[PDB]
């Protein structure tokens, strides 16, 4: 039960629900940092959408310019 | 950049950081609901700890009785 889980400290490491459908950017950065074409790969996913890397729910194509997608990929790849 | 990501709606589906190291319980429930020995499997992971199912960071053995671990597994498996 929930307050049992709270009392035993479990919620220090677990949440009840993933609020968001997409991966946190820091996890995207971890998965791709140190890989050579990740800015092209990420920019393309942001602009055109994709599914199946993290789960079944897809990301729709996003209304960004090629420049904006590239900058967002670069930003995400800099996450510390 | 961050306010670019905010402005383009991205943060409706993504967070900057996964605050917590462990999977959200609703994702644990999804992964195991409809499987026959999941209460024994989960109770055992809660009590004894484990790693590698969701990632590298391990869950330490947790200070619960066998009864408490079973009840927590059952609770988690009921999550809607
Ligand atoms: C970190 C210091 C933890 C605390 C305290 C608790 N949990 Fe945990 N849990 C943690 C991690 C890093 C993981 C993933 C382990 C892995 O294999 O990658 C888990 C996992 C679970 C699970 C799923 C186990 C599985 O094999 O899928 C459950 C059901 C679970 N955790 C429950 C749970 C409970 C009830 C806790 C308090 C008694 C609890 N955890 C504490 C990290 C940590
Ligand atoms: C839901 C309605 C989304 C919004 C709006 C945006 N994102 Fe998204 N994103 C979403 C999902 C469900 C996923 C996982 C897709 C999968 O393959 O399982 C993603 C993924 C990303 C990624 C990683 C792509 C990869 O192949 O690993 C990035 C870099 C990303 N998303 C960024 C991003 C940006 C910058 C957004 C606003 C312009 C954005 N997403 C919106 C869901 C949704």
Curated annotation (Swiss-Prot), chains A, B:
| Positions annotated to bind heme c | 10, 13-14, 59
Alphabetical keyword list: Electron transport, Heme, Iron, Metal-binding, Signal, Transport
Please verify whether the record's keywords include Iron: yes
Q: How does it get modified after it is made?
A: Binds 1 heme c group covalently per subunit.
Top-level taxon of origin: Bacteria
Q: Which family does it belong to?
A: Belongs to the cytochrome c family.
Q: Could you give a GO molecular-function term held by this entry?
A: iron ion binding
Ranked from the top, the taxonomy reads: Bacteria, Pseudomonadati, Aquificota, Aquificia, Aquificales
What name appears for this protein in its UniProt entry? Cytochrome c-552
- Origin organism is Hydrogenobacter thermophilus (strain DSM 6534 / IAM 12695 / TK-6)
Note the residue range shown relative to the complete protein.
19 to 98 of 98
What function does this protein fulfil? Reacts with hydrogenase.
């Amino acid at each position: 039960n929930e307050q049992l889980a709270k009392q035993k400290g479990c919620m220090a490491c677990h949440d009840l629900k993933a609020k968001k459908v997409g991966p946190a950017y820091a996890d995207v950065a971890k998965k791709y940092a140190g890989r050579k074409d990740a800015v092209d790969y990420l920019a393309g996913k942001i602009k055109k959408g994709g599914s199946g890397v993290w789960g079944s729910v897809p990301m729709p194509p996003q209304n960004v310019t090629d420049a904006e997608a590239k900058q967002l990929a670069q930003w995400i790849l800099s996450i510390k």
